[PDB]
């Protein structure tokens, strides 16, 4: 396996598996500090899903919330985790998203997701790729089918991996006193692009469902 990413992705997935039990740990009808964030993020899933997917947003609530909150916790492990002293001879210790493979996995997941919706809910024989509006629109089918997953992934992946490198490229020259607005802009936009992959996934499901 590609170890340099997998080793740290294991402990980030451990953070995920613990947040899986955070649900069943504390029941609060009125959630005070911290859990109100959980309810607000559930509301955020409601927002993006009901806004873009359409009707069967709720069985896709899991599939959108997973990538959204996972980009959240991976931004956490990338920047906000104190990792100055730790040293690995296998490679840099930045984030789970350091490898292309995680983002192409999210890509294929979203792709087969809207393909699944468009094959089940619509007909099996033909879906939006079939050339109904104008029968000479096969280049549109080819291009969009070929470009959606990989660049869908690249949109997030580029910024996240770029900052994951830029942080150590900055510390290699100047200590942490200078790179901190860079950390700020990164922690700013890394959750936005999480939202972006989420809403574009949702829009592709809506395309499949229409």
């Amino acid at each position: 396996i590609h170890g340099q990413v997998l080793i740290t992705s294991w402990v980030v997935i451990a953070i995920l598996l613990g947040s899986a039990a955070i649900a069943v740990r504390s029941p609060q009808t009125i959630p005070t500090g911290g859990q109100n964030f959980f309810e607000y993020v559930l509301e955020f899933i409601r927002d993006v899903s009901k806004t873009q997917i359409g009707e069967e947003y709720r069985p896709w609530v899991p599939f959108i919330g997973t990538m959204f909150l996972f980009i959240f916790v991976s931004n956490w492990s990338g920047a906000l985790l104190p990792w100055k002293i730790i040293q690995l001879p296998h490679g840099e210790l930045a984030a789970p998203t350091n490898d292309i493979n995680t983002t192409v996995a999210l890509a294929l997941l979203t792709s087969v997701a809207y393909f699944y919706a468009g094959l089940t809910k619509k007909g099996l024989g033909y879906f939006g790729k079939y050339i109904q509006p104008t029968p000479i629109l096969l280049p549109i089918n080819i291009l969009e089918d070929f470009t959606k997953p990989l660049s869908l992934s690249f949109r997030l992946f580029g910024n996240i991996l770029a900052d994951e490198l830029v942080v150590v490229v900055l510390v290699s020259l100047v200590p942490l006193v200078v790179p901190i607005p860079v950390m700020f802009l990164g922690l700013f936009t890394s959750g936005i692009q999480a939202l972006i992959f989420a809403t574009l996934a949702a829009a592709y499901i809506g395309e499949s469902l229409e």
């Binding site: 649900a23 009808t29 309810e39 559930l42 919330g65």
Partner: protein, 56 residues
């Protein structure tokens, strides 16, 4: 997790909505009941008017 969060949300929403709709229904109940109250009152006092006019 989605089950748990949507579950507590559904708890509070369900109880508030049921509250409001039963409130509307019991308001309908009081209007109808007091209408029939004063109607039966008119009926009894009208039986009084009837017995008065009849003995008259």
């Amino acid at each position: 997790l989605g089950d748990f969060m949507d579950k507590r949300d559904a708890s509070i929403k369900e109880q508030l909505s049921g509250v409001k709709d039963t409130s509307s229904e019991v308001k309908q109940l009081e209007e109808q009941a007091n209408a029939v109250m004063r109607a039966a009152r008119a009926e009894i006092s009208a039986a009084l008017n009837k017995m008065k006019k009849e003995t008259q």
